[PDB]
């Protein structure tokens, strides 16, 4: 289940 939404994940960190 690899995380593909890098843009959103970066903003959530």
């Amino acid at each position: 289940p690899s995380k593909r939404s890098f843009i959103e994940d970066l903003l959530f960190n």
């Epitope: 289940p1 593909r4 939404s5 890098f6 959103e8 994940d9 959530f12």
Partner: antibody, heavy 122, light 108 residues
């Protein structure tokens, strides 16, 4: 082919809550952040919010103020939007849209569903 | 949040015209700027992302430029399907936000 399909819209009385849903095909749902967008009749596109691919994180438009909640089920691969305390001007088409993909250089909101219409009326 | 302003709010044009629509952000959004097209009763279509990258399946008379706060959508040679409403949208930071839309109709 990427496909997103919203369901659950219809006529609902003000003050009630309504849960709409989005089902997907053509990609691994659990890999993606997922977004909702709304469009009131004759008005512009308005972002509602997003939930992270694992469900741990969410973010909403400034105007939501806790009144709408996004959820997801990475076993049935469904996205939900629960809209509470509905008022007449909540009437709008609601679109689900996929989050970004860094591997394919796909931006957030590349792929959209066809929308589902929520009509708030007494 | 970040406000996106578009100019003009509406314009009329003819087949074969060069049309330019601008989007201005209230904060620097680097290149994290997209353009959408919407026809009546249809979901919007992603045209442009990363300010200047044309999306797959989109005809290349569309092009985007700009970085930071000022962005332009150029339609180099307007065609029949391009009479539509255009929205810019930023994904530099949460909450994501859209501009108000610019409608392009047929000149007569």
């Amino acid at each position: 082919e990427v496909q997103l399909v919203e369901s659950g819209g219809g006529v609902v009385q003000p003050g009630r809550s309504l849960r709409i849903s989005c089902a997907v095909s053509g990609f691994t749902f659990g890999s993606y952040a997922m977004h909702w967008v709304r469009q009131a009749p004759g008005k512009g596109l308005e972002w509602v919010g997003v939930m992270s691919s694992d469900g741990h994180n969410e973010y909403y438009a400034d105007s939501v103020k806790g009144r709408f909640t996004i959820s997801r089920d990475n076993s049935r691969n469904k996205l939900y939007l629960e809209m509470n305390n509905l008022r007449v001007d909540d009437t709008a088409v609601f679109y689900c849209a996929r989050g970004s993909d860094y591997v394919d250089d796909s931006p957030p909101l590349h792929y959209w569903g066809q929308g589902t219409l929520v009509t708030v009326s007494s | 949040d970040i406000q996106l302003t578009q100019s003009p709010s509406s314009l009329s044009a003819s087949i074969g015209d060069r049309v330019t629509i601008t989007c201005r952000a209230s904060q620097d959004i680097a290149n994290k700027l997209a353009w959408f097209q919407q026809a009546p009763g249809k979901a919007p279509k992603s045209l442009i992302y990363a300010a200047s990258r044309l999306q797959s399946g989109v005809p290349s008379q569309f092009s985007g430029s700009g970085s930071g706060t000022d962005f332009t959508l150029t339609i180099e040679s307007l065609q029949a399907g391009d009479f539509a409403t255009y929205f810019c949208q930023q994904y530099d930071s949460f909450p994501f936000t859209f501009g108000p839309g610019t409608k392009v109709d047929v000149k007569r």
